[PDB]
Amino acid sequence: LSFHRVDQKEITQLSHLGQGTRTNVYEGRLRVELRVVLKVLDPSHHDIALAFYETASLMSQVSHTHLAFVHGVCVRGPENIMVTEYVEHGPLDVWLRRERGHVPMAWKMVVAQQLASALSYLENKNLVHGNVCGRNILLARLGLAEGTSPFIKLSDPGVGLGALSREERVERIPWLAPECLPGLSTAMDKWGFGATLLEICFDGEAPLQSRSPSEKEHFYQRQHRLPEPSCPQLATLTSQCLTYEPTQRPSFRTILRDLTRLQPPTVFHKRYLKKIRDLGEGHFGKVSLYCYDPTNDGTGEMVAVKALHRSGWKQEIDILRTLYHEHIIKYKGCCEDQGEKSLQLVMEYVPLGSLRDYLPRHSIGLAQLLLFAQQICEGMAYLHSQHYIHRNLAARNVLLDNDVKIGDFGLAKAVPEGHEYYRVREDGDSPVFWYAPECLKEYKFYYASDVWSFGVTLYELLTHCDSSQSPPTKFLELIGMTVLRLTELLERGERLPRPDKCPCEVYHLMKNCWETEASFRPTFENLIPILKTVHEKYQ
Ligand SMILES: O=C(Nc1ccnc(NC(=O)C2CC2)c1)c1ccccc1Cl
Ligand SMILES: O=C(Nc1ccnc(NC(=O)C2CC2)c1)c1ccccc1Cl
Numbered sequence: 001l002s003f004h005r006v007d008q009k010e011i012t013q014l015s016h017l018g019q020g021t022r023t024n025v026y027e028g029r030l031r032v033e034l035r036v037v038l039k040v041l042d043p044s045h046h047d048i049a050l051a052f053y054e055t056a057s058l059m060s061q062v063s064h065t066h067l068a069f070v071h072g073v074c075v076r077g078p079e080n081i082m083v084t085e086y087v088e089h090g091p092l093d094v095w096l097r098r099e100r101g102h103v104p105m106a107w108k109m110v111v112a113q114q115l116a117s118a119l120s121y122l123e124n125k126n127l128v129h130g131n132v133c134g135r136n137i138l139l140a141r142l143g144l145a146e147g148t149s150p151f152i153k154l155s156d157p158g159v160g161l162g163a164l165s166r167e168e169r170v171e172r173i174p175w176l177a178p179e180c181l182p183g184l185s186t187a188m189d190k191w192g193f194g195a196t197l198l199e200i201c202f203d204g205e206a207p208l209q210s211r212s213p214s215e216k217e218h219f220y221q222r223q224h225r226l227p228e229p230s231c232p233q234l235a236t237l238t239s240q241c242l243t244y245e246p247t248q249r250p251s252f253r254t255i256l257r258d259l260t261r262l263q264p265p266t267v268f269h270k271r272y273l274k275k276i277r278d279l280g281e282g283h284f285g286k287v288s289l290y291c292y293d294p295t296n297d298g299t300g301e302m303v304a305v306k307a308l309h310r311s312g313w314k315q316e317i318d319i320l321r322t323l324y325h326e327h328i329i330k331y332k333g334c335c336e337d338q339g340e341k342s343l344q345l346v347m348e349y350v351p352l353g354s355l356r357d358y359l360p361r362h363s364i365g366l367a368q369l370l371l372f373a374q375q376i377c378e379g380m381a382y383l384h385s386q387h388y389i390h391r392n393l394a395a396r397n398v399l400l401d402n403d404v405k406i407g408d409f410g411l412a413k414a415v416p417e418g419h420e421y422y423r424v425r426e427d428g429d430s431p432v433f434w435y436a437p438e439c440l441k442e443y444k445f446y447y448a449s450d451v452w453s454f455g456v457t458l459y460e461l462l463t464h465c466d467s468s469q470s471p472p473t474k475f476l477e478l479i480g481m482t483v484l485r486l487t488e489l490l491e492r493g494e495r496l497p498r499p500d501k502c503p504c505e506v507y508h509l510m511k512n513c514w515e516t517e518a519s520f521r522p523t524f525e526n527l528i529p530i531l532k533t534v535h536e537k538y539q
Pocket of ligand 1: 018019020087088089
């Protein structure tokens with residue numbers, strides 16, 4: 001379970017906006033200054049306080065243009081509070097009820113498309129929202145003015161569901177999937193979506209409004225079909241969505257297929273960038289989370305921006321521009337400081353962040369730890385094929401969205417085709433405890449040096465980045481100074497110990513990787529099959 005930690009001092013609570021199940025929503029401010037909303041959870045049952053925190057987790061590990069941003073969770077005495085993105089026009093059903101008779105079906109189709117896109121995203125990630133209703137859809141941009149179009153953000157689902165009472169599940173009918181009545185199918189969000197489309201078509205009026213909880217239950221028991229909307233093939237889409245048998249409900253790829261058919265660059269300006277938080281310090285500078293809102297309408301995208309010799313900084317940007325791979329951090333563009341002042345690197349925001357901070361948070365097993373390892377090799381083997389040495393492979397520089405992403409290209413160099421190794425004396429810091437004996441002793445960097453660097457990250461994966469059991473601390477226990485004592489240590493054959501509960505088979509690879517002679521080390525291409533075979537072992 002993962003979300004960012006928010007302090008009680010950072011938040012301020014404002015006007016009460018309304019109530020959700022077991023919650024009281026407030027406008028607020030985040031001192032990281034920032035307009036937010038505070039969903040406050042009433043002092044409640046553990047089973048439900050956890051299902052609230054489970055939601056914050058689902059939402060802190062996702063990144064989509066049509067999903068409302070979760071800043072983190074804060075504890076203000078007896079109450080659990082979640083800091084969410086404040087959206088200008090608020091709950092969609094409320095808005096539709098007030099805009100009754102001034103909303104075209106063209107406008108509703110854009111919304112339907114956007115919502116389906118946010119759920120198509122969740123579907124690919126095998127994640128379930130569970131509370132898709134117009135109240136949990138927020139209106140950022142109106143889209144009523146000529147030349148414009150609506151923009152929505154699907155908000156957090158609040159307390160889980162099923163964690164909730166049965167007579168509360170009955171109150172959520174017809175948004176509630178019928179299978180969910182006896183107290184998790186990804187098929188439940190295709191029922192909620194279809195029920196939401198009816199809510200949207202009927203301009204905020206809930207279908208089955210004038211029915212008692214007992215009357216609602218009867219409708220589901222007797223399986224009466226839900227009302228047909230306005231028109232056209234939307235009634236077809238709605239109907240398939242609203243099938244009591246979950247297996248018959250169409251996929252969000254098919255929903256978004258039907259919807260897209262029903263229809264009629266690298267320059268970032270500092271002005272449109274609005275900081276959220278800092279993300280970490282790397283080689284060359286700080287990475288900070290930004291929001292890039294060019295239209296100022298609160299519909300921008302979340303980017304990671306890195307700042308701050310100048311020549312070697314440019315090199316970081318030039319290398320990253322030319323790398324396209326599933327496990328390497330993605331280049332987006334550039335930002336110019338001031339009149340010649342400096343250049344800024346715009347990247348993709350990686351929801352779960354560095355492994356170094358993620359690992360001592362839920363002691364994840366061999367299946368997960370090894371999956372990461374094989375991927376770092378999948379990403380490193382591609383880097384090496386592009387004729388570059390990394391020189392900075394550590395767990396601090398390995399990011400993860402789900403469950404995966406290799407960053408910090410500050411030390412990466414290009415090896416000219418002919419040359420065996422690359423000489424670098426430095427004039428900066430270097431992760432010595434992740435460097436091979438030839439790197440420390442003679443300043444020589446072979447492709448083989450990154451493989452040494454790998455085995456060291458592989459160690460951290462298995463120590464769960466334990467600060468007491470870490471490459472700098474453990475290699476220093478062996479002494480009682482610099483790289484010189486380290487050089488002789490490794491030259492004797494002395495290695496980092498085996499982490500507790502590290503399968504001996506895994507610790508063999510680390511040893512293979514920590515070969516003194518660089519030419520005796522396995523290649524990154526050679527390690528992928530080896531890691532696949534082993535990853536198809538610890539289940
Ligand atoms: O979704 C809610 N509120 C949100 C979330 C983010 N932004 C807003 N913005 C506004 O309400 C603006 C119109 C004033 C509301 C909300 C508010 C009260 C009660 C229950 C819920 Cl679920
Ligand atoms: O790129 C870096 N960090 C990034 C980039 C994109 N997303 C994240 N995500 C987070 O930090 C999560 C916790 C919010 C980190 C970064 C920062 C310092 C050192 C090495 C790297 Cl690879």
